Design a binder for this molecule. Sequence first.
Ligand code: BCB
Ligand code: BCB
Ligand code: BCB
Ligand SMILES: C/C=C1/c2cc3[nH]c4c(c3C)C(=O)[C@H](C(=O)OC)c4c3nc(cc4[nH]c(cc(n2)[C@@H]1C)c(C(C)=O)c4C)[C@@H](C)[C@@H]3CCC(=O)OC/C=C(\C)CCC[C@H](C)CCC[C@H](C)CCCC(C)C
Ligand SMILES: CC(C)=CCC/C(C)=C/CC/C(C)=C/CC/C(C)=C/CC/C(C)=C/CC/C(C)=C/CC/C(C)=C/CC1=C(C)C(=O)c2ccccc2C1=O
Ligand code: HEC
Ligand code: HEC
Ligand code: HEC
Ligand code: HEC
Ligand SMILES: CC(C)=CCC/C(C)=C/C=C\C(C)=C\C=C\C(C)=C\C=C/C=C(C)/C=C/C=C(\C)CC/C=C(\C)CCCC(C)C
Ligand SMILES: CCCCCCCC/C=C/CCCCCCCCOC(=O)[C@H](O)CO
Ligand SMILES: [Fe+2]
Lengths: 332, 323, 243, 273
Amino acid sequence: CFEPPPATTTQTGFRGLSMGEVLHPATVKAKKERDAQYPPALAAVKAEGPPVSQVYKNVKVLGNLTEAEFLRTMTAITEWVSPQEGCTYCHDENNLASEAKYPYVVARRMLEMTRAINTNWTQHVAQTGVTCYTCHRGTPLPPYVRYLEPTLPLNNRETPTHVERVETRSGYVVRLAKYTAYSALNYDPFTMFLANDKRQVRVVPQTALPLVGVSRGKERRPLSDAYATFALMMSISDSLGTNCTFCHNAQTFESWGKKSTPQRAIAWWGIRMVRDLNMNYLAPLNASLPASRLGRQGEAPQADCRTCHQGVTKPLFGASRLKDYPELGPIK
Amino acid sequence: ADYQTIYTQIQARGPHITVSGEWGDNDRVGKPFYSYWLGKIGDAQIGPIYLGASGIAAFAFGSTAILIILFNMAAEVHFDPLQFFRQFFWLGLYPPKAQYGMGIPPLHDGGWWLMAGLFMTLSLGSWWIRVYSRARALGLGTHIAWNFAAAIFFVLCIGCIHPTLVGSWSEGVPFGIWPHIDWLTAFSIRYGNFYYCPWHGFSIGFAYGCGLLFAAHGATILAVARFGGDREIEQITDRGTAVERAALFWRWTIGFNATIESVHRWGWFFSLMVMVSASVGILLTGTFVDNWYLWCVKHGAAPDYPAYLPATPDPASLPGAPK
Amino acid sequence: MYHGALAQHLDIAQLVWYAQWLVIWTVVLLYLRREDRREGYPLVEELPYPKTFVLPHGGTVTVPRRRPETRELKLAQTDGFEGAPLQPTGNPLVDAVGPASYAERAEVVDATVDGKAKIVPLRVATDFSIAEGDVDPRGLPVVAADGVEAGTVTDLWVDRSEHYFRYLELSVAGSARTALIPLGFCDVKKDKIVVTSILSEQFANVPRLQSRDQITLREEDKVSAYYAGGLLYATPERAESLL
Amino acid sequence: ALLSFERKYRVRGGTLIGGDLFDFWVGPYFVGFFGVSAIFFIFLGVSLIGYAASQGPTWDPFAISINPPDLKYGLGAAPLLEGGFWQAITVCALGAFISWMLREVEISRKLGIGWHVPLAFCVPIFMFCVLQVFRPLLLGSWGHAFPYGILSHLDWVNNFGYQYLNWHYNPGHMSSVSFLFVNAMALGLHGGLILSVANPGDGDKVKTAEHENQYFRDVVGYSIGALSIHRLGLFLASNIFLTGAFGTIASGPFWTRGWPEWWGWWLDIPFWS
Ligand code: BCB
Ligand code: BCB
Ligand code: BCB
Ligand SMILES: C/C=C1/c2cc3[nH]c4c(c3C)C(=O)[C@H](C(=O)OC)c4c3nc(cc4[nH]c(cc(n2)[C@@H]1C)c(C(C)=O)c4C)[C@@H](C)[C@@H]3CCC(=O)OC/C=C(\C)CCC[C@H](C)CCC[C@H](C)CCCC(C)C
Ligand SMILES: CC(C)=CCC/C(C)=C/CC/C(C)=C/CC/C(C)=C/CC/C(C)=C/CC/C(C)=C/CC/C(C)=C/CC1=C(C)C(=O)c2ccccc2C1=O
Ligand code: HEC
Ligand code: HEC
Ligand code: HEC
Ligand code: HEC
Ligand SMILES: CC(C)=CCC/C(C)=C/C=C\C(C)=C\C=C\C(C)=C\C=C/C=C(C)/C=C/C=C(\C)CC/C=C(\C)CCCC(C)C
Ligand SMILES: CCCCCCCC/C=C/CCCCCCCCOC(=O)[C@H](O)CO
Ligand SMILES: [Fe+2]
């Protein structure tokens, strides 16, 4: 029923405002241990020699690497994504230039995606950055992905119960609930807010009085939007292992300046990054994946905050391999 | 210690009393029965109860609303009984999610909610008639009905009058345990933090005030139970030492005091004002204020605090920022 | 343009705020605080027009009561200071001062809705009984604060309107009389009724009823007040500081 | 200065300590040892609020705020301007409240009435201590306590709830609110019932104990009784905070997740999952 004390608490606002983190040490410990499994950087190799655009046949993204550097990247990718199957997860064992296995073409695109995150989305990932591991954690299917309807368990390495399965209609409300930190909010914030850029998260007026022409009848947004935004925030909070005060002074959720933390601005960039990943890199992979990887509407699995963060405010507690793998970005 | 203030040590039994009303004496139903254990802390007699057209109508209308709600809840779990029982609190009947304005929404998206609200409203109106008319039948003033009217009015404010004033049924309260709760936050969010609505604050001072007053008054009566202070009607018409001592307890404590009649007016007023204040807040919300925090800022009232972590500009305003 | 905006930097919610505070202070100060003054005024040592009640069984009363007769307080002042406490000049239980004080209620028997005597012993209320499970105190000894047996319970007095016992009546040992005691002063055990408010000797002077089988509102007050006085006066140490 | 019926009750006695020394009245107010101590602590507390407030940015009553220390001071002394005034005011506050309560005991004793009111008053004092003392001690810092400001304390309440994502799902809160609501309802029913009987209208007769019970038996099939409704009202009011306290103290020291998630004890039972 309960979590025994002591609680670890931080301060994220002016004294007397009850703003900050509230953490269970055993939980933090467990997540640190899981995340500590991040394989170390591979040893540095020879700088020096022909580029693989010359040496190999079908290199389209990493062509400027030396052979040693390139094969180092292939070793790293294998550890991070398909360590149990090895190189032949993506490659034809008798022809390494062949693109015949679907993971190969997906991986090329993921190389482009990863370089784009570390190059174009530094407003979010800073100099920490991401590798294949950040999401995949050693398996071809990342453990925390989203479809265009809620799915359970959140971690797809866990066996579902009958009621958790997406086909069992009686379990829908719980699938929704377990995506919004157990709330009864009747909204899927993934498809609403993170799959694409169609909706506005903000719902609160920035004036005291109602502006004429936007405040009556069909001029107005429905109150549902406010519930849906709350659902997104419950999800974001749970996805990062945190609460509203990490980012907001609840006095005024809609205000920036002294009323929001620096982390709130990083979160904002995070939403933008996720929409780009989903719209431009992940969703289009439905044409490359086997039917067995797709959801019930033919969608490829897509990313949310949890895909990388997995219950922690910085993914992997801020572990980085950025300087170890320059070929994953930032690209000059 | 006065053990009688804790429970009744020796309970009494006698023939059951019936006070005749101007009408409806023949519509009292039930054989009264006695609970010994209830009898320790209240009257042991349960029943009979009065039927009457308005109470019956209440039950017909209210049961209809409950059936609409429950059926929609059951559909939400695909009519699986185990999941219904498990998930009950999470289940709900929701106002329209799309903006149709004041258009009657589709049954799948708000229509059943509006229909349950219609039946609930009829049920509350019917019960109000019962509460009012029973007083009249028994030669009593209608003080309880008027207080009940303000509660009903508050429910109509959050149910249909605010929706009608801003012109959207999407703003109404859902039916359901957690879902009606989730609305509190949605609504507070939409209107810029209800802590900054002065009427929310008035309603809370009165609500807390009912706490204070019923603790203070209940305690006071128990404290003068040895003098029959619980017999408040004849203490009003013929002041006794019970209520002299009660008045003096408060006079000597806070410098002033009530009478045994007027303390009930204080309580009735405070109760009433919890609901009157709430209704006014709600009636101003969205109609004439869009963001209560910013309205307080406009009028110089809101507290401000130094930055702890660095002030953080809205990244949406940065040059080149995405939408 | 904004809904609710008025001339000046003025808006509708703003004007309703002032109105709401004005309504509250008007009700509190001009109504509620006036109703609060219908007893105890005018003060001794702003007022509403008198209120008249039509009584359930004929007649009227107008409050506050003005009694044609006025009681003598056996109290002396302890000092010249206006706020100094008073001190009993005799026996405060019999003289009924301090917490032994009673109100000058009507010398009328409180009535049921049908006009019968409301508070009556079970010997009169022959249709009433004690709930199964509870002690019948009749025939049990009453033991006073000093642990001395003061008398023996003879009857219970029931409120016929509320179905609730309000007094025990006991024969007073050695004094050829009976006395009532409110049940709030009684600790009802299986073998005895314990009364810590007064000592055994002090039962002799409990206020006496005019009639054996009925009790007036004033008598109820006199009876109840006597035991209450015991709490402060049963012994000399009861008026002094606890610590 | 005295009510018409007041003199006869103004006797010496009933003090817990002090004897005759403080056993007197100032106007209507009884003094007693705890009157003296109450005024002492009120004066000290209010003077500290004054000094602290003058050092701040505003004299606007809504905007003024005297805040506890940063978490990092723990349970130690904090400098006067950075949490120390708050610490001193809180000690004064508790002295005043406890003094108030004990003075009410002395008043009760003198009047020969029960001590039910001071006992009932122990409840809000207890809740104050939960908020400002017990919970902060369990978490290890006075900085978890609420600030003294008309509007600022609402900002604390607000952020505190949202630290647990949705405080409405807190079970001790659910109990607390339910009691708040049923208490307010019951006070209106009770006040209304008494007034309806004494004020039937027109020139109608005042009604009776029997009419009170008939009204509620008719409307809801049960009437609790004239004495019992007073016990019930005290019980309902008290339990706003007696049950609330559990939800307050749980939050942080015995639960670090959001409140809705706590309900997994029920939702996540394997046999219906
Ligand atoms: C965990 C939740 C809390 C909470 C949540 C809360 C909310 C959500 C709201 C309030 C509001 C209020 N609170 Mg607060 N509160 C208050 C006092 C107040 C008042 C400013 C106001 C109206 C209360 C009322 O009428 O109650 C019943 C008592 C009555 C009717 C008797 C009169 C009491 C009188 C108005 C108290 C005035 C105290 C002044 C601030 C002066 C302080 C002392 C000075 C003299 C040194 C005190 C004195 C305390 C203490 C001592 O602990 C306290 C604790 C809390 N409040 C907890 C931290 N309170 C309301 C408000 O309008 O805030 C601006 C409001 O909306
Ligand atoms: C994050 C969200 C918040 C929020 C959102 C909120 C909203 C949206 C509204 C309030 C309102 C109110 N809030 Mg508030 N709030 C309150 C206290 C209160 C209440 C005093 C007040 C009136 C509501 C009421 O009495 O309903 C209880 C009484 C009711 C519901 C009346 C029911 C009567 C009816 C006749 C009964 C019918 C029963 C039938 C049997 C039903 C049959 C059904 C069948 C037929 C289907 C406190 C003490 C706090 C603290 C300590 O933090 C707080 C914080 C918050 N509130 C947060 C800021 N609050 C109301 C208000 O004042 O607005 C201005 C309001 O509308
Ligand atoms: C977004 C945040 C939320 C929130 C956060 C919240 C928190 C953090 C806590 C509560 C708590 C509580 N909330 Mg709650 N809340 C409540 C209701 C309540 C109260 C029943 C309860 C107890 C308040 C308390 O501790 O007073 C305390 C009052 C005190 C201590 C008064 C002390 C008085 C003192 C002894 C005497 C003072 C004397 C003056 C100084 C004298 C002045 C001199 C003059 C008068 C002469 C309602 C009805 C709602 C609605 C309608 O939504 C709501 C929404 C919310 N609450 C939001 C979801 N709420 C508390 C609780 O029990 O939670 C389980 C609590 O800790
Ligand atoms: C569940 C039980 C309920 C309950 C019960 C009862 N309630 C009682 C009794 C009972 C039985 C009485 O016997 C007693 C009394 O006499 O009644 C007339 C009393 C009283 N309830 C008061 C306020 C009250 N009740 C609240 C809540 C409940 N009550 C709950 C609901 C709340 C809320 C909800 O906020 C408030 C504000 C005072 C009016 C009065 C104490 C005066 C005092 O103690 O004088 C002595 C102290 C002073 C006169 C001032 C002290 C100033 C200090 C030093 C400096 C200020 C510090 C402060 C911390 C700053 C905070 C400011 C900030 C929040 C803005
Ligand atoms: C002058 C000086 C310094 C003197 C020194 C001595 C000394 C200690 C003085 C104290 C000075 C101080 C601190 C005064 C402040 C007093 C305070 C705390 C005042 C607060 C008043 C408030 C806000 C009360 C809230 C509750 C409220 C709305 C009460 C109004 C209704 C009343 C009066 C209820 C009391 C009351 C109740 C509850 C009954 O049940 C009852 C039953 C039968 C008859 C009478 C009564 C009765 O009067
Ligand atoms: C999928 C996740 C892969 C795994 C596992 C391994 N490799 Fe790979 N390989 C992959 C891609 C997307 C590409 C093209 C990269 C680009 O920039 O376009 C490659 C390419 C190679 C080559 C070049 C072959 C050629 O075109 O001539 C070689 C020699 C190669 N990879 C080797 C290799 C080894 C040794 C691996 C296991 C340790 C391995 N790859 C794993 C995708 C993936
Ligand atoms: C999180 C944002 C990711 C990062 C960083 C990388 N990948 Fe990824 N991958 C991600 C998703 C949401 C999916 C779709 C789910 C799926 O398993 O199909 C994928 C998929 C792949 C695959 C195909 C796996 C399969 O279906 O069998 C491969 C081979 C793959 N990803 C490779 C890969 C590489 C090499 C990465 C680093 C350069 C990398 N991914 C990063 C999410 C994310
Ligand atoms: C940081 C990681 C956050 C946490 C934790 C929470 N929220 Fe948030 N919020 C965040 C951002 C980046 C934004 C803006 C998004 C955008 O695209 O503009 C928001 C927005 C809100 C809003 C709407 C504000 C408005 O201007 O209308 C609300 C009402 C809100 N957030 C509430 C909220 C709650 C209740 C949270 C905890 C449960 C919470 N947020 C967490 C960033 C972050
Ligand atoms: C992987 C591709 C990510 C996804 C998907 C999301 N985030 Fe992220 N985030 C990521 C990295 C590599 C970092 C580290 C940056 C650093 O400063 O060390 C972060 C950081 C954040 C933070 C800042 C935490 C802090 O500064 O203490 C926040 C608040 C954050 N991320 C929020 C967030 C949200 C709301 C997301 C979904 C919309 C999200 N992130 C996705 C990598 C990834
Ligand atoms: C076991 C006992 C006997 C009964 C069971 C009760 C039960 C299980 C009920 C159903 C499940 C539950 C518990 C539901 C709870 C729902 C709750 C708490 C809901 C709360 C609030 C809902 C509110 C305030 C809704 C208000 C709605 C309105 C006022 C609507 C008004 C509509 C109109 C006036 C219609 C006018 C418009 C016209 C065009 C038709
Ligand atoms: C406030 C609790 C909330 C629940 C209450 C509801 C039930 C009512 C119970 C009241 C018990 C307290 C009364 C004690 C006797 C009073 C004289 C006091 O004198 C005494 O003899 C003692 O030593 C002091 O208490
Ligand atoms: Fe009463």
